Amino acid sequence: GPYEATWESTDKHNAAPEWYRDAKFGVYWHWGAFTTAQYASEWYPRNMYEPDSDQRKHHTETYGPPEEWGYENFIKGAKDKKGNFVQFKPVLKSKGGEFDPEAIIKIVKGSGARFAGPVAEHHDGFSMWDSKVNEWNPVNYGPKLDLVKLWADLVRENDMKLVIAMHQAYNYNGFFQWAPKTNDTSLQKLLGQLPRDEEDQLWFDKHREMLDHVQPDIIWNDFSLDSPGECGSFEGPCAVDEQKRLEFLAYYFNRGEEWGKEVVTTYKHHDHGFRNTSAVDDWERGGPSNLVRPYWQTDDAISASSWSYTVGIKYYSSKAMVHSLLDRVSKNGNMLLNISPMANGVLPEEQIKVLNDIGDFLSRYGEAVYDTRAWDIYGEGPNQVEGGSFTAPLQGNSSDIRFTRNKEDDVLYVTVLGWPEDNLVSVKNLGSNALVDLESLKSVELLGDKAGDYVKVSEWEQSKDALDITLPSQPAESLAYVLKLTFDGGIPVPQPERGAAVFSKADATGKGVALALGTFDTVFLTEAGLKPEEIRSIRVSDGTKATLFSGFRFTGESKELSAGEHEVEDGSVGSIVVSKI
Ligand SMILES: *[C@@H]1O[C@H](CO)[C@@H](O[C@@H]2O[C@H](CO)[C@@H](O[C@@H]3O[C@H](CO[C@H]4O[C@H](CO)[C@@H](O)[C@H](O)[C@@H]4O)[C@@H](O)[C@H](O[C@H]4O[C@H](CO)[C@@H](O)[C@H](O)[C@@H]4O[C@H]4O[C@H](CO)[C@@H](O)[C@H](O)[C@@H]4O[C@H]4O[C@H](CO)[C@@H](O)[C@H](O)[C@@H]4O)[C@@H]3O)[C@H](O)[C@H]2NC(C)=O)[C@H](O)[C@H]1NC(C)=O
Numbered sequence: 001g002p003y004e005a006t007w008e009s010t011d012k013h014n015a016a017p018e019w020y021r022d023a024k025f026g027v028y029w030h031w032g033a034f035t036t037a038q039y040a041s042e043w044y045p046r047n048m049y050e051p052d053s054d055q056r057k058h059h060t061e062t063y064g065p066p067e068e069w070g071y072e073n074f075i076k077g078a079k080d081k082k083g084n085f086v087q088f089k090p091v092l093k094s095k096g097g098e099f100d101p102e103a104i105i106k107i108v109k110g111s112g113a114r115f116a117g118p119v120a121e122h123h124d125g126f127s128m129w130d131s132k133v134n135e136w137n138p139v140n141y142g143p144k145l146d147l148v149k150l151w152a153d154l155v156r157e158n159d160m161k162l163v164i165a166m167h168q169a170y171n172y173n174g175f176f177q178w179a180p181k182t183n184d185t186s187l188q189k190l191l192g193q194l195p196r197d198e199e200d201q202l203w204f205d206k207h208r209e210m211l212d213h214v215q216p217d218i219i220w221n222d223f224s225l226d227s228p229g230e231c232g233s234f235e236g237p238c239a240v241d242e243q244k245r246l247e248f249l250a251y252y253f254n255r256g257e258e259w260g261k262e263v264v265t266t267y268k269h270h271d272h273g274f275r276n277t278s279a280v281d282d283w284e285r286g287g288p289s290n291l292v293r294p295y296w297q298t299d300d301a302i303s304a305s306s307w308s309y310t311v312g313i314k315y316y317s318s319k320a321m322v323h324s325l326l327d328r329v330s331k332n333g334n335m336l337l338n339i340s341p342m343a344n345g346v347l348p349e350e351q352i353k354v355l356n357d358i359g360d361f362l363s364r365y366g367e368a369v370y371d372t373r374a375w376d377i378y379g380e381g382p383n384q385v386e387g388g389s390f391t392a393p394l395q396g397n398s399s400d401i402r403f404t405r406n407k408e409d410d411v412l413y414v415t416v417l418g419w420p421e422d423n424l425v426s427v428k429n430l431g432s433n434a435l436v437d438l439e440s441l442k443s444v445e446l447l448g449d450k451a452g453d454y455v456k457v458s459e460w461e462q463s464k465d466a467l468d469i470t471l472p473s474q475p476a477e478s479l480a481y482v483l484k485l486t487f488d489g490g491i492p493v494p495q496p497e498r499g500a501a502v503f504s505k506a507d508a509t510g511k512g513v514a515l516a517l518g519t520f521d522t523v524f525l526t527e528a529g530l531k532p533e534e535i536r537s538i539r540v541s542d543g544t545k546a547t548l549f550s551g552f553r554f555t556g557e558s559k560e561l562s563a564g565e566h567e568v569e570d571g572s573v574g575s576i577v578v579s580k581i
Pocket residue numbers: 275276277292293294519547553554555558577
């Protein structure tokens with residue numbers, strides 16, 4: 001194929017194709033031999049060995065000292081301290097068991113997911129397809145099933161794109177640091193104890209074999225691709241050999257071409273292992289606090305605990321999952337939601353309810369979500385994501401709105417995260433302070449009880465503070481409500497309270513992009529719809545300054561502009577920093 005194992009060659013791959021930007025919502029599942037103990041988290045295989053840990057205590061009391069009853073026993077099977085046989089060994093419903101993958105995929109489809117799939121290999125060294133390069137797999141041991149193939153075939157049968165999650169870098173970069181050393185070369189492969197060159201080759205060989213086996217539309221990667229300092233006390237680079245990363249990218253992108261498919265690979269945002277030229281950044285739980293470009297995604301989980309099922313696990317609400325999805329989508333990302341089947345393969349009813357409720361929202365209000373794109377301002381209101389460390393998912397109310405818009409850029413969806421008791425929705429960024437002319441606002445409609453229903457909104461006034469919209473009779477109850485605002489000739493460009501707006505014509509008219517406080521490089525401005533060479537004017541808000549750079553990313557000649565309107569020379573700007581005075 002055309003791709004070579006170099007950064008320059010693989011940079012040319014289109015990171016986020018249109019189908020992926022259209023998709024918005026997907027589902028995957030942390031289910032595997034790491035679930036067998038149903039204790040603590042999916043990191044149980046690592047922590048069962050940790051000195052003085054609660055997981056080691058539990059393991060020692062339940063199974064045996066981890067030096068005698070090692071993690072491999074969950075895969076190969078062994079009796080616990082009370083004499084019960086323990087093994088990851090799901091039994092198909094068609095064979096009289098409880099594992100019903102077909103039912104689970106129907107539930108996932110019903111949730112409105114447009115991409116779905118398994119964790120194919122976590123950190124624990126267990127490849128869940130029929131693997132020749134890794135004997136530690138569920139065809140050789142346990143259920144005698146190619147779980148990844150089973151899932152993939154069902155995902156395709158149900159008209160969803162296939163995502164496969166792979167976490168096999170941390171396996172040999174410290175996950176198993178507390179496991180006993182072994183001279184058994186098979187056990188070394190499970191526990192990441194092979195020579196590092198062999199481990200680096202195996203990282204690639206696992207990817208290669210898996211992706212040829214099931215032809216994934218998305219390959220999702222966890223950390224330790226190149227994330228120095230992130231592997232705790234283990235002495236090592238917290239990384240995969242650079243050559244092997246490049247060989248993976250070229251191999252996958254070449255197979256995509258061969259298959260006639262636009263494929264995607266993701267990596268953790270903070271990780272340096274891939275580049276945002278050809279791979280999609282995957283943000284930490286909660287996502288970014290702001291609207292980020294280029295297109296990105298984030299993972300989340302129903303569980304209020306672990307990513308893998310544990311006894312006593314608690315869950316978040318349907319409302320929080322839906323409001324979180326809206327928030328991510330408004331900020332120019334997708335949300336990949338993790339679910340957590342029990343070790344026997346059963347999906348708990350609380351999780352099914354959440355998925356049903358998300359699907360009930362998306363089947364009704366999908367117009368405001370699927371196939372849309374971010375506006376230049378993601379939303380308004382008091383309830384926000386802080387970013388950084390996660391605590392609990394976003395839950396908004398009638399005070400909060402999130403924006404999305406259509407591809408034609410003449411329809412703005414205003415989604416309010418609760419029913420206003422005062423029957424009023426006030427959109428600040430469409431008020432007069434926002435310097436917005438509403439002459440072109442042709443209609444305002446409330447989306448109704450079923451998709452394709454619209455209830456006309458008759459009364460609205462534009463104040464200084466906001467477009468003040470009076471709502472009609474409340475439709476059937478839902479977790480959020482959607483207003484559809486149709487303009488002729490395009491949505492107006494708002495002036496942020498503190499911020500700026502750039503324009504393609506010299507007098508603050510034409511195509512434009514609103515900017516918050518922050519840093520906006522050539523990629524940002526281009527994706528937002530105005531290549532910076534085409535900027536010919538800028539309006540800087542009161543209390544704000546803008547610094548223009550000739551360079552792509554805040555280098556080169558610079559110029560500072562205070563509050564007001566300014567003309568810009570064609571081709572003079574590459575990037576912009578917008579700051580509070
Ligand atoms: C996708 O991946 C790519 C590749 O990894 C990512 O690209 C990286 O992006 C980084 C963030 O933009 C960028 O880093 C910036 O580089 C600037 C240029 O650096 C080079 O030139 C300077 C000058 O010769 C050298 O000193 C420097 O060593 C480099 O060689 C730096 O100037 C940037 O530093 C400033 O910003 C950071 C915040 O990011 C601050 O911590 C830092 O203190 C600097 O602060 C000033 O400028 C910023 C404007 O960015 C202001 O916000 C801030 O208030 C500071 O203001 C003072 O100075 C400015 C003049 O600079 C002045 O006008 C102002 O009034 C203040 O006095 C920063 O380090 C990487 O270079 C870039 N890497 C590559 C390979 O391209 C990309 O982000 C990824 N995309 C996404 C979406 O994640």
